[PDB]
Amino acid sequence: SFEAIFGTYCNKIEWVTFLGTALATAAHAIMFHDLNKMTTGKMLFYIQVPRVATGAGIPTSRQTTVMVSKYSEKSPITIPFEISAACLTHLKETFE
Amino acid sequence: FALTVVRTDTFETDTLLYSTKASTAVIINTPIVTKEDRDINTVFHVSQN
Amino acid sequence: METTVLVTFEQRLTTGDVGKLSRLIGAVIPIPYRHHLLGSSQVGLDAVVKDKTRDYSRMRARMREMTLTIMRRVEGNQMILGVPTHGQCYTIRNTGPVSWEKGDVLTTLPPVFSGEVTGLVSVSDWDLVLPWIVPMALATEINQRMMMLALLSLDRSHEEVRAATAQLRVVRYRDATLTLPEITIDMRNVCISLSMIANLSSEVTLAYVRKLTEELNKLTALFVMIRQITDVISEQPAFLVCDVSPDDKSALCIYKG
Amino acid sequence: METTVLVTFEQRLTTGDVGKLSRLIGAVIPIPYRHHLLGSSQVGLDAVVKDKTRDYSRMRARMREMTLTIMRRVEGNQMILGVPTHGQCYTIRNTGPVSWEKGDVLTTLPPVFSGEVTGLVSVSDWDLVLPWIVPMALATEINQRMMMLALLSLDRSHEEVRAATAQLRVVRYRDATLTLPEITIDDTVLIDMRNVCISLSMIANLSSEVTLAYVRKLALEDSNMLLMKCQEITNYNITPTEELNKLTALFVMIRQITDVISEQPAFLVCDVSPDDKSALCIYK
Amino acid sequence: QAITARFFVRESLGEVEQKNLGVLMFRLDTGIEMPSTVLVSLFFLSMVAENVSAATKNTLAAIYGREGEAIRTWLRDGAWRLHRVVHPLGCTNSITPGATCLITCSMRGHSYNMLKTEIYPLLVPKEIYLDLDGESTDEIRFVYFVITYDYNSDRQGRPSAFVVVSRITHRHTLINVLRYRFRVSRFHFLNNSISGYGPSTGCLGTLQRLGWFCSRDSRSGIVASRAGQLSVVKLEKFYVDVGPLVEFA
Amino acid sequence: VSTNNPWGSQRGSLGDVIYNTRNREKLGHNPSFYSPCAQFFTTDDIINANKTLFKTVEEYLNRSICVEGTNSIVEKPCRFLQEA
């Protein structure tokens, strides 16, 4: 039998998505499988400039396309993750 | 004598941080799991570059 | 595989500097702290050789207190620095003038431009002066010759100890030699400490020999100088080579503390 | 020998006790035997913090003969004391009452000796008092003043020794005020104080006359704020190789006389948590 | 996980070791400029240490002190010993019956034959080993190498060395238990220390960690080769950890 | 007006050497005893702030991306040499 009742509480942590945040409209997410081959953080931008087509005597000297290079900025997310394998062996078991 | 006496005070400041739409593009690595040799607290270092 | 700290460059990169870094893939890096941020102002012994008042004892103590790291790769403006861990077998590079033999105990010292100046990839008042990576007993003997330069250097006014400092002046090791800087206020305070030990050793234990607040004042001014002079001796050797790559560019080592 | 210790308490741990074990599971324990399985009476040096003669000299000497662990895993009553493999990075919570000066060698402190605190909980008249992890310079100071406040007693009156300990046994440092343990006049202090006397009598000759007169003829030249207190507290040779052997022998004497009052280096800290409660540490 | 390193050993220094593996090997940039870089056996430094009595000393000098009295002990016996010149690196692997001896000395770990069939013991000779032991030991006795002089005449007089095996891990307690039985050495050490007024000597002793071993399978024994027998002590599962050269006086 | 006091004119004064770290480290000082006028009575944090600020402004206007000149926001008027 029992004598003393026992009511406690174990809240669930709110799942927050980066790509579903208001922070995500500052970002442009692109995910890879691996990053080994394309490693060098050069990123070119082939930037077009619109031509002002007035009759000022001169046009733009080209249909000018400027390739501006940029350097990447890496950052690792390294987080520890502990799971008790002494109870994960019961996921291994699942016996009857 | 006069004196000018100087005061380094320090401010816990909350800041605004505005961006454009596609200001910085991120490329996210696959969430690579890092497993070491089995010690009792079998930690995984789960990481992405 | 290991801990890995990134450097961002404020400078617009020179392709020749990127080529020199890609030569120096295997190098070793002086770093203040293993926060994952590193700025170019933080990275390098530039942060040591910027106060020209300061001298070799504090150079060595900064290289003791600051993290010894291994260059791994360069990715655009970022630099990958893998922080070594005690017990693993790592490829490092000989940036100092001293050649390396196999099995040798390997030890960090700051480089000295007294006759053997060797600049680097420096741009915009920041150099990447890497520490001399030098044998253990040779490192201790470098510091011993430095402290005796700062001791004997006061008697430049006499021809005799002037000749003794000029006779010292020089450290010769296997197949690679170097001169040594003259101190005529770090080494000055170091030898203030040494001279207090030297004076008070004939002054404070004479009534202890016969048995074995004034005394606390004297032995306090003895022992704190003793601590400050002992702290800059134990060379804390960083590496221990298994095999040396020939022409002495690199060496596969095991890392110590 | 052994790297992952399982420790059973034979005494009684309750809900509050299994809560309070979590913070100590950051911390550090010395083991007497380095077995996989050890008794909780042996685990820690709390077995001989109740030495009734109660000398920091023997607290010191036994932690010199000990070997540290890192506590882990509040599961049941069992304690995973990972014996730290040398040169690996581990989280360590603090009970030493300092922010550890991030970037330094953090070291073992035998019994605090400013009060007898109960470390974990007092069950079955046994607490778990750990060595408190205070930095290397603070430990070197804390053994320095240990030897000093008995060094005065050999040639001065013991009442004057008491009146000078009344100043110099309270260590002045930021968040590090400690009271030295009513300093033990002891043979343990004697056997190393005689060697301090030996080293000073030897540096009385390993001292060059140049090394004597460096301060004494630099004070004739100019001034320095050490050098004034150093004023207070043909003629020379041309043999620098023998002076190098003098400096070599003198360095051996001063490192010996420093390791008199300079105990073992321990944890070199990777990352202290921003609340200054947990420290990733290498280099035991 | 163990780190090993192939080393140039002379084929006139590969012996002993080559008969029965297990030795310490020290390196040194010595005085003659043509063969400056030399690696060294523990039996080869035994003929420099005074603690090996002159019969056993000249016994292994009759083994390979031909090379010793060629140039090398004229650089170690004759040219006076420093602890600086010699540095311990561990126990030999790869016996190497080749043209030039290329012995792959270990750095850290239990010195092993490859394939994990045989464990290499450390052969520490008898007179350099025993006399600084502490108590009766259980499974993880630590090995320390200590050079200890004694001041007699030539500002040092005589070099000598020891291999102290002790459970006492700590530096200062270990140098105090050295100071227990080395009172005589510090008597005459103080004597020529106060003899040197301007000239100098160089201090008494130098301690360093070498590792640990199984130490309940520890036993003494003997080897035998050219120039006869050699009573030694066999340290079975000798983990290697070369520590720092820590001097005392 | 040129200066406000001729000790504040030149070196050899109570600020320009004694609150300066050069003659202060001749006279000995402390880790944590920060002096709030030392940041200006040293020439060091004058010259370093000016060089970092000028090169970061010049690389803002070479573009017309750059960071590490943004470090003055922590020490913001005290890298502006203005005595906040």
Side-chain angles (χ1 to χ4, degrees), chain C residues 86 89 101-105 136-137 140-141 144 173-174 240-242 254 256, chain E residues 1 3-8 27 29 37 84 87 89 102 107-108 241-242 244-245:
Chain C
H86 177 80
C89 199
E101 289 286 328
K102 292 188 288 185
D104 194 0
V105 181
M136 185 181 182
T140 309
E141 196 68 31
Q144 287 184 353
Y173 199 67
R174 56 171 184 264
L240 180 62
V241 53
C242 66
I254 192 168
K256 299 291 182 71
Chain E
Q1 293 298 112
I3 166 176
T4 66
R6 176 183 288 177
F7 285 157
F8 291 102
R27 69 183 190 274
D29 289 330
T37 64
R84 272 82 187 273
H87 296 280
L89 206 57
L102 288 174
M107 297 288 176
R108 295 195 73 238
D241 190 7
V242 175
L245 277 298

mmCIF file of all heavy atoms in Angstrom, chain C residues 86 89 101-105 136-137 140-141 144 173-174 240-242 254 256, chain E residues 1 3-8 27 29 37 84 87 89 102 107-108 241-242 244-245:
data_model
loop_
_atom_site.group_PDB
_atom_site.id
_atom_site.type_symbol
_atom_site.label_atom_id
_atom_site.label_comp_id
_atom_site.label_asym_id
_atom_site.label_seq_id
_atom_site.Cartn_x
_atom_site.Cartn_y
_atom_site.Cartn_z
ATOM 1 N N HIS C 86 48.690 16.025 -25.027
ATOM 2 C CA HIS C 86 49.762 15.225 -24.443
ATOM 3 C C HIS C 86 49.624 13.734 -24.727
ATOM 4 O O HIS C 86 48.679 13.095 -24.257
ATOM 5 C CB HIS C 86 49.766 15.487 -22.937
ATOM 6 C CG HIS C 86 50.763 14.690 -22.166
ATOM 7 N ND1 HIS C 86 52.097 15.024 -22.100
ATOM 8 C CD2 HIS C 86 50.614 13.585 -21.400
ATOM 9 C CE1 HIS C 86 52.727 14.156 -21.328
ATOM 10 N NE2 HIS C 86 51.850 13.268 -20.897
ATOM 11 N N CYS C 89 50.956 11.780 -31.581
ATOM 12 C CA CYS C 89 52.115 11.854 -32.458
ATOM 13 C C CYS C 89 51.821 12.828 -33.598
ATOM 14 O O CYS C 89 51.017 12.530 -34.487
ATOM 15 C CB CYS C 89 52.452 10.460 -32.981
ATOM 16 S SG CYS C 89 54.099 10.278 -33.628
ATOM 17 N N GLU C 101 67.997 16.429 -34.013
ATOM 18 C CA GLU C 101 68.338 15.015 -34.075
ATOM 19 C C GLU C 101 67.171 14.189 -33.547
ATOM 20 O O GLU C 101 66.278 14.699 -32.868
ATOM 21 C CB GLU C 101 69.612 14.719 -33.276
ATOM 22 C CG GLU C 101 70.923 15.254 -33.881
ATOM 23 C CD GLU C 101 71.415 14.468 -35.093
ATOM 24 O OE1 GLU C 101 71.189 13.243 -35.149
ATOM 25 O OE2 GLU C 101 72.047 15.077 -35.984
ATOM 26 N N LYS C 102 67.180 12.900 -33.892
ATOM 27 C CA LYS C 102 66.095 12.005 -33.510
ATOM 28 C C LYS C 102 66.064 11.781 -32.006
ATOM 29 O O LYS C 102 67.095 11.812 -31.331
ATOM 30 C CB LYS C 102 66.230 10.662 -34.224
ATOM 31 C CG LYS C 102 65.993 10.728 -35.712
ATOM 32 C CD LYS C 102 65.951 9.339 -36.306
ATOM 33 C CE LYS C 102 67.334 8.720 -36.337
ATOM 34 N NZ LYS C 102 67.323 7.406 -37.029
ATOM 35 N N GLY C 103 64.858 11.593 -31.474
ATOM 36 C CA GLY C 103 64.669 11.312 -30.070
ATOM 37 C C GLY C 103 64.794 12.496 -29.140
ATOM 38 O O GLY C 103 64.434 12.369 -27.962
ATOM 39 N N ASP C 104 65.235 13.645 -29.644
ATOM 40 C CA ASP C 104 65.619 14.785 -28.829
ATOM 41 C C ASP C 104 64.417 15.396 -28.117
ATOM 42 O O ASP C 104 63.299 15.408 -28.637
ATOM 43 C CB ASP C 104 66.294 15.825 -29.725
ATOM 44 C CG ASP C 104 67.036 16.891 -28.950
ATOM 45 O OD1 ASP C 104 67.059 16.861 -27.701
ATOM 46 O OD2 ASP C 104 67.607 17.779 -29.610
ATOM 47 N N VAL C 105 64.658 15.905 -26.914
ATOM 48 C CA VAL C 105 63.635 16.590 -26.140
ATOM 49 C C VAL C 105 63.538 18.014 -26.664
ATOM 50 O O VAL C 105 64.554 18.709 -26.782
ATOM 51 C CB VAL C 105 63.973 16.581 -24.642
ATOM 52 C CG1 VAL C 105 62.907 17.267 -23.900
ATOM 53 C CG2 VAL C 105 64.103 15.179 -24.115
ATOM 54 N N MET C 136 66.331 20.911 -25.040
ATOM 55 C CA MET C 136 65.965 21.186 -23.651
ATOM 56 C C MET C 136 67.119 21.800 -22.866
ATOM 57 O O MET C 136 66.991 22.893 -22.290
ATOM 58 C CB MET C 136 65.505 19.881 -22.989
ATOM 59 C CG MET C 136 64.967 20.007 -21.577
ATOM 60 S SD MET C 136 64.486 18.405 -20.886
ATOM 61 C CE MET C 136 63.849 18.838 -19.271
ATOM 62 N N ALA C 137 68.249 21.090 -22.817
ATOM 63 C CA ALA C 137 69.431 21.599 -22.135
ATOM 64 C C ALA C 137 69.978 22.833 -22.825
ATOM 65 O O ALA C 137 70.495 23.736 -22.156
ATOM 66 C CB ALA C 137 70.500 20.513 -22.055
ATOM 67 N N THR C 140 67.776 25.705 -21.516
ATOM 68 C CA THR C 140 68.222 26.080 -20.176
ATOM 69 C C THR C 140 69.534 26.848 -20.232
ATOM 70 O O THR C 140 69.724 27.826 -19.501
ATOM 71 C CB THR C 140 68.397 24.841 -19.299
ATOM 72 O OG1 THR C 140 67.218 24.045 -19.364
ATOM 73 C CG2 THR C 140 68.619 25.244 -17.844
ATOM 74 N N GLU C 141 70.430 26.452 -21.135
ATOM 75 C CA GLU C 141 71.720 27.111 -21.213
ATOM 76 C C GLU C 141 71.616 28.485 -21.869
ATOM 77 O O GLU C 141 72.373 29.386 -21.504
ATOM 78 C CB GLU C 141 72.708 26.217 -21.956
ATOM 79 C CG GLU C 141 74.138 26.626 -21.751
ATOM 80 C CD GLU C 141 74.597 26.402 -20.322
ATOM 81 O OE1 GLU C 141 74.098 25.460 -19.665
ATOM 82 O OE2 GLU C 141 75.449 27.180 -19.848
ATOM 83 N N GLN C 144 70.553 30.545 -18.967
ATOM 84 C CA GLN C 144 71.671 30.736 -18.049
ATOM 85 C C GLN C 144 72.659 31.769 -18.574
ATOM 86 O O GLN C 144 73.121 32.634 -17.817
ATOM 87 C CB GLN C 144 72.387 29.411 -17.789
ATOM 88 C CG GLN C 144 71.627 28.451 -16.898
ATOM 89 C CD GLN C 144 72.415 27.195 -16.591
ATOM 90 O OE1 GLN C 144 73.495 26.972 -17.141
ATOM 91 N NE2 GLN C 144 71.889 26.375 -15.688
ATOM 92 N N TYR C 173 75.878 25.300 -30.385
ATOM 93 C CA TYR C 173 75.314 23.958 -30.310
ATOM 94 C C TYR C 173 75.712 23.216 -31.586
ATOM 95 O O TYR C 173 76.572 23.685 -32.335
ATOM 96 C CB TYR C 173 73.800 24.041 -30.101
ATOM 97 C CG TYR C 173 73.137 22.790 -29.563
ATOM 98 C CD1 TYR C 173 73.399 22.336 -28.273
ATOM 99 C CD2 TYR C 173 72.189 22.120 -30.305
ATOM 100 C CE1 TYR C 173 72.775 21.206 -27.768
ATOM 101 C CE2 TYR C 173 71.564 21.000 -29.811
ATOM 102 C CZ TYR C 173 71.861 20.549 -28.542
ATOM 103 O OH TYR C 173 71.242 19.434 -28.038
ATOM 104 N N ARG C 174 75.120 22.039 -31.816
ATOM 105 C CA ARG C 174 75.459 21.242 -32.993
ATOM 106 C C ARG C 174 75.082 21.963 -34.288
ATOM 107 O O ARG C 174 73.922 22.335 -34.503
ATOM 108 C CB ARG C 174 74.806 19.853 -32.927
ATOM 109 C CG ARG C 174 73.285 19.816 -32.757
ATOM 110 C CD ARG C 174 72.694 18.440 -32.922
ATOM 111 N NE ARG C 174 71.236 18.471 -32.833
ATOM 112 C CZ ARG C 174 70.539 18.223 -31.727
ATOM 113 N NH1 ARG C 174 71.159 17.888 -30.606
ATOM 114 N NH2 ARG C 174 69.212 18.279 -31.749
ATOM 115 N N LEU C 240 58.778 15.911 -28.255
ATOM 116 C CA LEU C 240 59.750 14.833 -28.135
ATOM 117 C C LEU C 240 59.660 14.042 -29.430
ATOM 118 O O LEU C 240 58.683 13.322 -29.653
ATOM 119 C CB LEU C 240 59.446 13.971 -26.918
ATOM 120 C CG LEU C 240 60.334 12.778 -26.571
ATOM 121 C CD1 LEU C 240 61.746 13.213 -26.261
ATOM 122 C CD2 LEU C 240 59.739 12.051 -25.385
ATOM 123 N N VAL C 241 60.665 14.190 -30.280
ATOM 124 C CA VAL C 241 60.589 13.728 -31.660
ATOM 125 C C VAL C 241 60.778 12.217 -31.720
ATOM 126 O O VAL C 241 61.615 11.655 -31.007
ATOM 127 C CB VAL C 241 61.612 14.487 -32.528
ATOM 128 C CG1 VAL C 241 62.995 14.416 -31.950
ATOM 129 C CG2 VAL C 241 61.634 13.967 -33.927
ATOM 130 N N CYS C 242 59.951 11.536 -32.519
ATOM 131 C CA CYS C 242 60.274 10.152 -32.846
ATOM 132 C C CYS C 242 61.248 10.091 -34.019
ATOM 133 O O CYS C 242 62.364 9.582 -33.880
ATOM 134 C CB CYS C 242 59.002 9.337 -33.112
ATOM 135 S SG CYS C 242 58.014 9.766 -34.547
ATOM 136 N N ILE C 254 56.153 13.497 -30.290
ATOM 137 C CA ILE C 254 55.084 13.341 -29.310
ATOM 138 C C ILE C 254 55.075 14.579 -28.417
ATOM 139 O O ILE C 254 56.127 15.155 -28.118
ATOM 140 C CB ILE C 254 55.219 12.023 -28.516
ATOM 141 C CG1 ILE C 254 53.943 11.744 -27.723
ATOM 142 C CG2 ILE C 254 56.433 11.998 -27.604
ATOM 143 C CD1 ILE C 254 53.873 10.367 -27.168
ATOM 144 N N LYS C 256 54.503 16.959 -25.188
ATOM 145 C CA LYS C 256 54.605 16.978 -23.736
ATOM 146 C C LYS C 256 54.188 18.355 -23.231
ATOM 147 O O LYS C 256 53.761 19.219 -23.998
ATOM 148 C CB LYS C 256 56.026 16.641 -23.279
ATOM 149 C CG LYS C 256 56.518 15.262 -23.686
ATOM 150 C CD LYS C 256 55.763 14.185 -22.945
ATOM 151 C CE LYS C 256 56.247 12.790 -23.288
ATOM 152 N NZ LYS C 256 57.591 12.508 -22.720
ATOM 153 N N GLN E 1 49.075 2.211 -30.150
ATOM 154 C CA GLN E 1 49.062 3.413 -29.325
ATOM 155 C C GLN E 1 50.450 3.787 -28.831
ATOM 156 O O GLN E 1 50.674 4.949 -28.467
ATOM 157 C CB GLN E 1 48.130 3.239 -28.122
ATOM 158 C CG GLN E 1 46.649 3.128 -28.459
ATOM 159 C CD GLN E 1 46.102 4.370 -29.141
ATOM 160 O OE1 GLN E 1 45.738 4.333 -30.315
ATOM 161 N NE2 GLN E 1 46.056 5.478 -28.412
ATOM 162 N N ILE E 3 54.432 4.646 -29.190
ATOM 163 C CA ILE E 3 55.275 5.352 -30.144
ATOM 164 C C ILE E 3 56.701 4.825 -30.059
ATOM 165 O O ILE E 3 57.308 4.798 -28.980
ATOM 166 C CB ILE E 3 55.208 6.868 -29.905
ATOM 167 C CG1 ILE E 3 56.333 7.585 -30.641
ATOM 168 C CG2 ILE E 3 55.083 7.180 -28.441
ATOM 169 C CD1 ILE E 3 56.267 9.061 -30.513
ATOM 170 N N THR E 4 57.224 4.384 -31.199
ATOM 171 C CA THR E 4 58.558 3.820 -31.323
ATOM 172 C C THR E 4 59.322 4.580 -32.399
ATOM 173 O O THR E 4 58.720 5.190 -33.287
ATOM 174 C CB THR E 4 58.498 2.345 -31.696
ATOM 175 O OG1 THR E 4 57.941 2.212 -33.007
ATOM 176 C CG2 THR E 4 57.640 1.568 -30.725
ATOM 177 N N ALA E 5 60.653 4.532 -32.327
ATOM 178 C CA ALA E 5 61.505 5.318 -33.219
ATOM 179 C C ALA E 5 62.753 4.536 -33.601
ATOM 180 O O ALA E 5 63.545 4.174 -32.727
ATOM 181 C CB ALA E 5 61.895 6.637 -32.557
ATOM 182 N N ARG E 6 62.927 4.281 -34.899
ATOM 183 C CA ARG E 6 64.144 3.650 -35.396
ATOM 184 C C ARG E 6 65.342 4.573 -35.200
ATOM 185 O O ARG E 6 65.312 5.736 -35.611
ATOM 186 C CB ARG E 6 64.005 3.306 -36.877
ATOM 187 C CG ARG E 6 65.283 2.725 -37.465
ATOM 188 C CD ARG E 6 65.227 2.437 -38.967
ATOM 189 N NE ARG E 6 64.406 1.284 -39.325
ATOM 190 C CZ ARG E 6 64.173 0.907 -40.576
ATOM 191 N NH1 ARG E 6 64.713 1.579 -41.582
ATOM 192 N NH2 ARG E 6 63.415 -0.151 -40.827
ATOM 193 N N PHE E 7 66.408 4.049 -34.597
ATOM 194 C CA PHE E 7 67.588 4.819 -34.243
ATOM 195 C C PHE E 7 68.838 4.179 -34.810
ATOM 196 O O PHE E 7 68.955 2.949 -34.848
ATOM 197 C CB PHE E 7 67.758 4.923 -32.733
ATOM 198 C CG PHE E 7 66.814 5.869 -32.083
ATOM 199 C CD1 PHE E 7 66.509 5.740 -30.744
ATOM 200 C CD2 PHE E 7 66.212 6.878 -32.808
ATOM 201 C CE1 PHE E 7 65.637 6.601 -30.146
ATOM 202 C CE2 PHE E 7 65.337 7.747 -32.210
ATOM 203 C CZ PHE E 7 65.048 7.608 -30.877
ATOM 204 N N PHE E 8 69.775 5.033 -35.216
ATOM 205 C CA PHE E 8 71.121 4.604 -35.568
ATOM 206 C C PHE E 8 71.854 4.172 -34.310
ATOM 207 O O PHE E 8 72.187 5.005 -33.462
ATOM 208 C CB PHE E 8 71.888 5.734 -36.245
ATOM 209 C CG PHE E 8 71.388 6.081 -37.601
ATOM 210 C CD1 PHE E 8 70.600 7.204 -37.796
ATOM 211 C CD2 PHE E 8 71.729 5.299 -38.694
ATOM 212 C CE1 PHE E 8 70.139 7.535 -39.055
ATOM 213 C CE2 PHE E 8 71.271 5.617 -39.960
ATOM 214 C CZ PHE E 8 70.474 6.743 -40.141
ATOM 215 N N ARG E 27 71.046 9.483 -25.413
ATOM 216 C CA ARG E 27 71.658 10.142 -26.560
ATOM 217 C C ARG E 27 72.574 11.280 -26.115
ATOM 218 O O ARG E 27 72.453 11.803 -25.006
ATOM 219 C CB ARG E 27 70.594 10.676 -27.512
ATOM 220 C CG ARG E 27 69.861 11.817 -26.916
ATOM 221 C CD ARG E 27 68.762 12.348 -27.763
ATOM 222 N NE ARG E 27 68.329 13.581 -27.136
ATOM 223 C CZ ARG E 27 67.427 13.648 -26.170
ATOM 224 N NH1 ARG E 27 66.813 12.554 -25.743
ATOM 225 N NH2 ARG E 27 67.126 14.827 -25.658
ATOM 226 N N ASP E 29 75.322 14.622 -27.701
ATOM 227 C CA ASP E 29 76.137 15.435 -28.611
ATOM 228 C C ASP E 29 77.468 15.697 -27.916
ATOM 229 O O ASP E 29 77.639 16.696 -27.217
ATOM 230 C CB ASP E 29 75.442 16.746 -28.965
ATOM 231 C CG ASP E 29 74.248 16.552 -29.875
ATOM 232 O OD1 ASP E 29 74.243 15.592 -30.673
ATOM 233 O OD2 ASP E 29 73.312 17.372 -29.789
ATOM 234 N N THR E 37 77.107 12.705 -32.412
ATOM 235 C CA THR E 37 75.773 12.205 -32.078
ATOM 236 C C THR E 37 75.831 10.699 -31.808
ATOM 237 O O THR E 37 76.011 9.905 -32.734
ATOM 238 C CB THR E 37 74.816 12.523 -33.222
ATOM 239 O OG1 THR E 37 75.219 11.809 -34.398
ATOM 240 C CG2 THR E 37 74.842 14.013 -33.535
ATOM 241 N N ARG E 84 73.436 16.491 -18.039
ATOM 242 C CA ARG E 84 72.937 17.154 -19.241
ATOM 243 C C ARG E 84 73.245 16.360 -20.505
ATOM 244 O O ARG E 84 72.425 16.324 -21.432
ATOM 245 C CB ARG E 84 73.525 18.561 -19.364
ATOM 246 C CG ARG E 84 72.738 19.639 -18.654
ATOM 247 C CD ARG E 84 73.039 19.724 -17.176
ATOM 248 N NE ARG E 84 72.121 20.657 -16.537
ATOM 249 C CZ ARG E 84 72.314 21.968 -16.453
ATOM 250 N NH1 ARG E 84 73.416 22.516 -16.955
ATOM 251 N NH2 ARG E 84 71.408 22.733 -15.860
ATOM 252 N N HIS E 87 70.497 11.591 -21.954
ATOM 253 C CA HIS E 87 69.051 11.710 -21.817
ATOM 254 C C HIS E 87 68.362 10.381 -22.059
ATOM 255 O O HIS E 87 68.485 9.818 -23.154
ATOM 256 C CB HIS E 87 68.527 12.747 -22.797
ATOM 257 C CG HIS E 87 69.042 14.124 -22.534
ATOM 258 N ND1 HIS E 87 68.512 14.939 -21.560
ATOM 259 C CD2 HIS E 87 70.078 14.807 -23.074
ATOM 260 C CE1 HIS E 87 69.175 16.082 -21.537
ATOM 261 N NE2 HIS E 87 70.132 16.026 -22.444
ATOM 262 N N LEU E 89 65.641 7.529 -23.040
ATOM 263 C CA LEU E 89 64.500 7.514 -23.930
ATOM 264 C C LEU E 89 63.666 6.239 -23.857
ATOM 265 O O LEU E 89 62.496 6.265 -24.252
ATOM 266 C CB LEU E 89 64.995 7.778 -25.345
ATOM 267 C CG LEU E 89 63.941 8.386 -26.235
ATOM 268 C CD1 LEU E 89 63.428 9.666 -25.616
ATOM 269 C CD2 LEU E 89 64.585 8.716 -27.515
ATOM 270 N N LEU E 102 69.783 -0.728 -36.567
ATOM 271 C CA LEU E 102 68.723 0.266 -36.548
ATOM 272 C C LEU E 102 67.699 -0.218 -35.536
ATOM 273 O O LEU E 102 66.775 -0.965 -35.869
ATOM 274 C CB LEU E 102 68.146 0.470 -37.938
ATOM 275 C CG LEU E 102 69.121 1.230 -38.837
ATOM 276 C CD1 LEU E 102 68.623 1.314 -40.267
ATOM 277 C CD2 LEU E 102 69.358 2.616 -38.276
ATOM 278 N N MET E 107 59.098 4.918 -26.797
ATOM 279 C CA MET E 107 58.977 6.192 -26.099
ATOM 280 C C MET E 107 58.096 6.068 -24.866
ATOM 281 O O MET E 107 58.523 6.456 -23.776
ATOM 282 C CB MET E 107 58.394 7.266 -27.021
ATOM 283 C CG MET E 107 59.206 7.623 -28.231
ATOM 284 S SD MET E 107 60.672 8.564 -27.839
ATOM 285 C CE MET E 107 61.409 8.687 -29.463
ATOM 286 N N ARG E 108 56.868 5.562 -25.013
ATOM 287 C CA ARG E 108 55.913 5.391 -23.922
ATOM 288 C C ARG E 108 55.086 4.143 -24.188
ATOM 289 O O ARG E 108 54.634 3.919 -25.310
ATOM 290 C CB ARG E 108 54.962 6.596 -23.743
ATOM 291 C CG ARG E 108 55.630 7.903 -23.319
ATOM 292 C CD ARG E 108 54.683 8.996 -22.803
ATOM 293 N NE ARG E 108 54.155 8.687 -21.471
ATOM 294 C CZ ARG E 108 52.861 8.583 -21.175
ATOM 295 N NH1 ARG E 108 51.942 8.794 -22.107
ATOM 296 N NH2 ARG E 108 52.484 8.292 -19.938
ATOM 297 N N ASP E 241 57.899 6.035 -19.153
ATOM 298 C CA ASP E 241 57.525 7.448 -19.125
ATOM 299 C C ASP E 241 58.757 8.218 -18.659
ATOM 300 O O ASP E 241 58.983 8.369 -17.459
ATOM 301 C CB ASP E 241 56.332 7.710 -18.217
ATOM 302 C CG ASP E 241 55.788 9.111 -18.367
ATOM 303 O OD1 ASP E 241 56.243 9.850 -19.263
ATOM 304 O OD2 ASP E 241 54.916 9.485 -17.558
ATOM 305 N N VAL E 242 59.528 8.717 -19.620
ATOM 306 C CA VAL E 242 60.696 9.524 -19.298
ATOM 307 C C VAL E 242 60.240 10.875 -18.766
ATOM 308 O O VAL E 242 59.621 11.665 -19.484
ATOM 309 C CB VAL E 242 61.598 9.693 -20.520
ATOM 310 C CG1 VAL E 242 62.735 10.651 -20.181
ATOM 311 C CG2 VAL E 242 62.112 8.337 -20.976
ATOM 312 N N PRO E 244 61.000 14.573 -16.273
ATOM 313 C CA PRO E 244 61.929 15.701 -16.379
ATOM 314 C C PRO E 244 63.155 15.526 -15.501
ATOM 315 O O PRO E 244 63.110 14.938 -14.420
ATOM 316 C CB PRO E 244 61.080 16.884 -15.895
ATOM 317 C CG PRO E 244 60.135 16.276 -14.937
ATOM 318 C CD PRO E 244 59.820 14.907 -15.460
ATOM 319 N N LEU E 245 64.273 16.059 -15.994
ATOM 320 C CA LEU E 245 65.535 16.034 -15.259
ATOM 321 C C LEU E 245 65.413 17.004 -14.098
ATOM 322 O O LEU E 245 65.615 18.210 -14.252
ATOM 323 C CB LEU E 245 66.704 16.421 -16.160
ATOM 324 C CG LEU E 245 67.416 15.425 -17.087
ATOM 325 C CD1 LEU E 245 68.062 14.289 -16.312
ATOM 326 C CD2 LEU E 245 66.511 14.896 -18.201
#
